Write an enzyme that holds these catalytic residues in place. Structure first.
Site, short mmCIF file in Angstrom:
data_model
loop_
_atom_site.label_atom_id
_atom_site.label_comp_id
_atom_site.label_asym_id
_atom_site.label_seq_id
_atom_site.Cartn_x
_atom_site.Cartn_y
_atom_site.Cartn_z
N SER B 197 22.64 27.45 50.32
CA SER B 197 23.66 28.49 50.30
C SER B 197 24.86 28.05 51.15
O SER B 197 25.43 26.97 50.86
CB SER B 197 23.06 29.81 50.79
N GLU B 324 20.89 33.50 40.71
CA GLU B 324 21.64 33.45 41.96
C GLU B 324 22.32 34.77 42.29
O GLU B 324 22.55 35.07 43.47
CB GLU B 324 22.68 32.33 41.89
N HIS B 437 18.06 33.72 44.54
CA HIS B 437 18.65 33.08 45.77
C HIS B 437 17.73 32.80 47.07
O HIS B 437 17.38 33.75 47.74
CB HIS B 437 19.96 33.79 46.08
#
Ligand SMILES: *[C@@H]1O[C@H](CO)[C@@H](O)[C@H](O)[C@H]1NC(C)=O
Ligand SMILES: *[C@@H]1O[C@H](CO)[C@@H](O)[C@H](O)[C@H]1NC(C)=O
Ligand SMILES: *[C@@H]1O[C@H](CO)[C@@H](O)[C@H](O)[C@H]1NC(C)=O
Ligand SMILES: *[C@@H]1O[C@H](CO)[C@@H](O)[C@H](O)[C@H]1NC(C)=O
Lengths: 532, 532
Positions: B197, B324, B437
């Site tokens: 990330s 995501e 995610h």
């Protein structure tokens, strides 16, 4: 005599014609206007002066002066559309096929031919109305109208060349049918106008025009819509092309009067020879002299008429063919040819997009290219070829027709929508072109019923089913037989948006014909171009 | 002693930690900078002054001051990301896991945590490096860096709060690893930085920044890219948000000096309490204080560095997770909730699009909506929900990463691309969120190897395979074992653009990861917004 009919314009004498081992009556080449020749070139039509004696209505009339396709000499696929009589400015005639014995008050169908408003003939073998008149027992009329500059040169503000006179030709033929078809056994109160391509656009234009609405009962539109991008121009663009036409002929351009006078001294072929030189863009599917949004025939813009309900409310039946674009790519787009598979390269694809949306800026061209490109397989020649086919067909025919049908159904009294996707087994055009523009006409006119034509038994069955759909619709406002056991063609409604396929397979109902692409062509791209 | 290591900063004493019924050494909470407290808040980090005596490196350090997610109190799915130590501005420490017996010169992996540059901790249970260090026999480092305003408040032109100091925190930890990891058995010439990330974006930022390139050998980026829309702001926008931050705290705004002085007198929680108030738009997936394009850390714009090859050329391994976006829709978008299926209405869909592309004009919003709407089935709540998930994930993670990888591969020395799409059998988040995610991290860090965690045998096999991919890549520049019989992860090339799925099924190779959507996000939409 069954072949003698007395009309309000005078008596006419027809001929007995054989059809599928029977016979019917045919009245060919009936005049409905004064010859628009000499100082009446570019003018509104005038009604034909009544005649004494008997009009010999036994043979086809002349075709109107028009560009003649010579792209494939000898090839029947293209020459079947060319004029098959002598050409003449003296060309405002209609033809009637009448069941035998003469009916008393039967359904009337009036055919309006297409050809991009630059071409067309009522006398084509594929428009022979005897099979449809005989099989369905209807009075079949085919009219004619001036095309090209002769029908649509538009110098708005002048009364000598106002524009739209080819549409007024159609209207005057419809007036004559209204006034006289009773004497042939037709019911003037049950008249269906139908037409393909520019003829389908024409049909939709009479639905819209207040001056035409009262002359027919219901309407059929094949592969044509009044809002099509190619079917009309503004008054300013019509004026610009008329001036450019005179510039091509070394005319005095100082006034409308000077220009029109010059253009009337020219022989018909002189105008035709330069007709394609006035287009504003390098383009395909665009024609020089087309209807003009004049404030008269059309009182306001087409979209505001459609949005406000300013049109005839009746029943309509309409639809499209699977491969509307392949025609025009073959003739104008790089990489396409008649005798190859026409696999398209990534750069011919981009050239084609630009020819197809000539009014687009660079961002719009990108939007189109993105919408129709499979980016997993961008160099697939088959996908690029079929993608361009879809672009041309969606932009010019299918998505305009879907916009028209969705707007019309809000105010109309019944809508039936079809998608014709049977490729005739005897088509002489290459396979890559698919279900071509206009190759449903032969099924509408019953050609598969003639053995000599080749045609599978399944194609004869399809033709008969289509003819009975059209003729039952013309008679009742509904293509289906009441209480029949056959599958039913459902109404197209605002909510459901149902339609049927037309092919040799058992009927299938679908919804929202090409809605994904048509939202692009009808909502997003127009918005993109207006903002940029 | 195996637990005593003498470094250039001083001696450190670690602890023996059990791992999968064996043991390794851990050196937790080693300081690498001076505490950035008081008048050093918002300043660049300073190297830690050497110490006499033995540093007790037996327990985890403090976490940096940060926003704390309280959206689901008690719920492990969200609290597993929250700081699990006391929070402090005294937080610049790193942790090392070292195989036993101590290696001589082995591969080093340095983990950089994510959390949107506003949050993150090196001490999270899911970042426990002992399983990866033990299983693959590597020296595993996790660093820390200032987040939120403390790490990224940017008043460009001033030396007291220049911006990017959180990135300089990471660089200083990498400098310390370069300088001292030899004493722990690590090879300072074979260091792989990896992160997820904001940590993956960080990794890409060190590849780009000339001041960081020499401190590592190769790099791994998970669900993060330096060019991500949320990962950097301009100098002007950074200044605007810093001034707005002081406006929220009733600061004197007459000069940079006045503003910075005011912000330093504030307690950490005072800054955190108003941190979200400075965003320019109503948005999701946007964070207040992030890296700034300053002309220093980044000498020019990210796109021109990428285009000109102005970056470290090495091998990279990188990829994304299937879903995501679902994270951020749950927290910020109307219609999504944790305990329902979150079926989205056509109007919540449109609200979501606007939150997701906050910089779009109306035409751009239309372009996005069209790209992701199935117009045959527009009111399908599942399709609207998954469509928004894709919009958020494509725009913010996948398509930026694909732009980065395509630009990088032109100059780099080897690229391996993955698509992680296994949903863990023990995920506590709802099924609608999919392959969330960050839920590949637990597989990268070998958590499935611990029975107590639940975890299927197939998930343990997946974890081991992933850990060996990462560690073999770190050691050699290639995730595959030479001469092994196992399926081979192929190189990503400019021409072929191959990648693999990462899941419990037999390996499959694909090409052109989400190319259709990414051409929209990377080429068309940016062009549309610039023209309009
Ligand atoms: C009608 O005109 C055609 C044209 O040649 C002619 O052959 C035919 O005999 C004519 N019929 C009558 C009744 O005059
Ligand atoms: C058509 O109009 C008649 C009234 O004139 C109405 O009863 C009928 O329902 C209408 N049909 C449709 C399909 O709108
Ligand atoms: C290191 O610090 C922890 C913190 O309480 C303590 O429990 C431990 O005994 C210390 N070890 C040494 C060797 O000082
Ligand atoms: C990486 O660089 C070396 C030369 O330093 C070269 O031989 C090798 O082919 C390169 N590999 C790739 C994948 O570009």
């Amino acid at each position: 005599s069954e072949l003698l009919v007395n009309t309000k314009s005078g008596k006419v004498m027809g001929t007995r014609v054989p059809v599928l081992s029977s016979h019917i009556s045919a009245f060919l080449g009936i005049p409905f206007a004064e010859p628009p020749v000499g100082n009446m070139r570019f003018r509104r039509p005038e009604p034909k002066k009544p005649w004494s004696g008997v009009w010999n209505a036994s043979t086809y009339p002349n075709n109107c002066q028009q560009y003649v396709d010579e792209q494939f000499p000898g090839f029947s696929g293209s020459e079947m559309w060319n004029p098959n009589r002598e050409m003449s400015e003296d060309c405002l005639y209609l033809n009637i096929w009448v069941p035998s014995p003469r009916p008393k008050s039967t359904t009337v169908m009036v055919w309006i031919y297409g050809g991009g408003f630059y071409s067309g003939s009522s006398t084509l073998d594929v428009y022979n109305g005897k099979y449809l008149a005989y099989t369905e027992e209807v009075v079949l009329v085919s009219l004619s109208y001036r095309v090209g500059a002769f029908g649509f040169l538009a110098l708005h503000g002048s009364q000598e060349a106002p524009g739209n006179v080819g549409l007024l030709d159609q209207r005057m033929a419809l007036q004559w049918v209204h006034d006289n078809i009773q004497f042939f056994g037709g019911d003037p109160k049950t008249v269906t106008i139908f037409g393909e391509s520019a003829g389908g656009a024409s049909v939709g234009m009479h639905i819209l025009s207040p001056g035409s609405r009262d002359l027919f009962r219901r309407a059929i539109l094949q592969s044509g819509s009044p809002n099509c991008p190619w079917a009309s121009v503004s008054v300013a663009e019509g004026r610009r092309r008329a001036v450019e036409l005179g510039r091509n002929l070394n005319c005095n351009l100082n006034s409308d009067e000077e220009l029109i006078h010059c253009l009337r001294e020219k022989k018909p072929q002189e105008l035709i020879d330069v007709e394609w030189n006035v287009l504003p863009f390098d383009s395909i599917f665009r024609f020089s002299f087309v209807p003009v949004i004049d404030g008269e025939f059309f009182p306001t813009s087409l979209e505001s008429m459609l949005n406000s309900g300013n049109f005839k409310k009746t029943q309509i039946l309409l639809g499209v063919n699977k491969d509307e674009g392949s025609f025009f790519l073959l003739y104008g787009a790089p990489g396409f040819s008649k005798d190859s598979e026409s696999k398209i390269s990534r750069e011919d694809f981009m050239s084609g997009v630009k020819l197809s949306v000539p009014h687009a800026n660079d961002l719009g061209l990108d939007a189109v290219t993105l919408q129709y490109t499979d980016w997993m397989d961008d160099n697939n020649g088959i996908k690029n070829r079929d993608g361009l086919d879809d672009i041309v067909g969606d932009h010019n025919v299918i998505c305009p027709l879907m916009h028209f049908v969705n707007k019309y159904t809000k105010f109309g009294n019944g809508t039936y929508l079809y998608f014709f996707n049977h490729r005739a087994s005897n088509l002489v055009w290459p396979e890559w072109m698919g279900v071509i523009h206009g190759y449903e006409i032969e099924f509408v006119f019953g050609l598969p019923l003639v053995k000599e034509l080749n045609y599978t038994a399944e194609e004869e069955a399809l033709s008969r089913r289509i003819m009975h759909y059209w003729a039952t619709f013309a008679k009742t406002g509904n293509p289906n037989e009441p209480h029949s056991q056959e599958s039913k063609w459902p109404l197209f409604t605002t909510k459901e948006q149902k339609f049927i396929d037309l092919n040799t397979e058992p009927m299938k109902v679908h919804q929202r014909l090409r809605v994904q692409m048509c939202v692009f062509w009808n909502q997003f791209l127009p918005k993109l171009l207006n903002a940029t």
